[PDB]
């Protein structure tokens, strides 16, 4: 299968310089054109440009002739994104796309690049039972004070799909804070044992918190 | 550069109706066009290439029209998994270009949400920090205010308010209200409430 492996998170200071990474698997990144995109929170999709492996060459979107320098390496099949003088106008989702030269048939899963002066922090997951209450049986997770993004959220480590909603986080204050709920039918809560996982790898943290009335 | 205007920014219809996105090239890219489609928290998915030609595994329901420099998607049977931001792209000449996206909904029918007030843990209040959240769930329209009662009256302290994208299989929206305070301003007041708009929920 054709796979494109991406970076993981990055938290760097304003002025600081980075360098993506994209790796093919699959496929051989001499015989494509590869791309950078780039996505802000909520907004639309913004191409950087695109390298050919083969001879080197390059194309930029004029927005960014000057923030950023598409590189390739045919052997280790890899394609990279350097961006410079880092500002917050940079902090956003990167992703390297293959162009067959009709369309892009192959995504990264994208990389989270966070500029910023902040530390990376560690959640804290409080539970959230009813405590009060019957057909249905609602309960939540809270997960506080995290930086940077982003977290996943898992219940009975992926059991137990539907009847789930994670909030997008919010800034509560220097952090994150987001929600979770998931909704078991009554008998379940009770004998069942439902717990929800966290990952929150810029600080290679994982918890699983068991609810509790 | 090509400059590439996408229309409409944002729309919604009821299942079964037929919805058409389009694009206009600032010249003619003589059908070098393909659109895209992005999920929430997704990377995006290839669905016309050429102006006209489907991508593998897409449905026939998509379809692609227009030549020179206008073009269009068009969707005819709606489907609530069909909730999802669109992109056209360019490659009559590089730089290639992105359109700047239609952001489509589903139009269904008035659904009241599921309230579910939640009491601040112990962990919590461990440290000197308390947080009631509540949860809206499954509810249509998206729109939806929600109130707070410290026991019986209405004080500042702290809201923050956070809603899901739209479902793909019921096509409703989701919320959750946290009230934060701190611990000792918890240890006080004894009724808390969440309200939408009513519709109440609380504990003591």
């Known amino acids: 299968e054709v796979q494109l492996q991406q970076s993981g998170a990055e938290l760097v200071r304003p002025g600081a310089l980075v360098k993506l990474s994209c790796k093919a698997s699959?496929?051989?990144?001499?015989?494509?054109?590869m791309h950078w995109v780039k996505q802000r929170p909520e907004q639309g999709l913004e191409l950087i440009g695109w390298i050919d492996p083969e001879n080197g060459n390059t194309i930029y979107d004029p927005k960014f002739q000057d923030k950023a320098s598409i590189t390739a390496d045919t052997s280790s099949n890899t394609a990279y994104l350097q961006l410079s003088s880092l500002t917050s106008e940079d902090t956003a989702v990167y992703y390297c796309?293959?162009?067959?030269?009709?369309?892009?048939?192959?995504w990264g899963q994208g990389t989270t690049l966070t500029v910023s002066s902040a530390k990376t922090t560690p959640p804290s997951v409080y539970p959230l039972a009813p405590g009060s209450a019957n057909s249905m049986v609602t309960l939540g997770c809270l997960v506080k004070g995290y930086f940077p993004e982003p977290v996943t959220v898992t219940w009975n480590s992926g059991s137990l799909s539907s009847g789930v909603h994670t909030f997008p986080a919010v800034l509560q204050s220097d952090l994150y804070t987001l929600s979770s709920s998931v909704t078991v039918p009554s008998s379940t809560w009770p004998s069942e044992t439902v717990t929800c996982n966290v990952a929150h790898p810029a600080s290679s943290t994982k918890v699983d918190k068991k609810k509790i009335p | 550069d090509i400059k590439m205007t996408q229309s409409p920014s944002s729309m919604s219809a009821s299942l079964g109706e037929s919805v058409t996105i389009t694009c206009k090239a600032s010249r003619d890219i003589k059908s070098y066009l393909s659109w895209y489609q992005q999920k929430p928290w997704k990377s995006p998915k290839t669905l016309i290439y050429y102006a006209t030609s489907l991508a593998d595994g897409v449905p026939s329901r998509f379809s692609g029209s227009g030549s020179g420099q206008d073009y269009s998607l068009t969707i005819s049977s709606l489907e609530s998994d069909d909730t999802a931001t669109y992109y056209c792209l360019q490659h009559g000449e590089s730089p290639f270009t992105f359109g700047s996206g239609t952001k489509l909904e589903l139009k269904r029918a008035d659904a009241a949400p599921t309230v579910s007030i939640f009491p601040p843990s112990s962990e919590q209040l461990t440290s000197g920090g308390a947080s009631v959240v509540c949860f809206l769930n499954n509810f249509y329209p998206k729109d939806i205010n929600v109130k707070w009662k410290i026991d019986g009256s209405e004080r500042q302290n702290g809201v923050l308010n956070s809603w899901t994208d739209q479902d793909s299989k019921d096509s409703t929206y989701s919320m959750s209200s946290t009230l934060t305070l701190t611990k000792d301003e918890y240890e006080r007041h004894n009724s808390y409430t969440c309200e939408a708009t009513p519709i109440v929920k609380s504990f003591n």
């Open positions: 699959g496929f051989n990144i001499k015989d494509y054109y």
């Open positions: 796309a293959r162009d067959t030269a009709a369309y892009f048939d192959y």
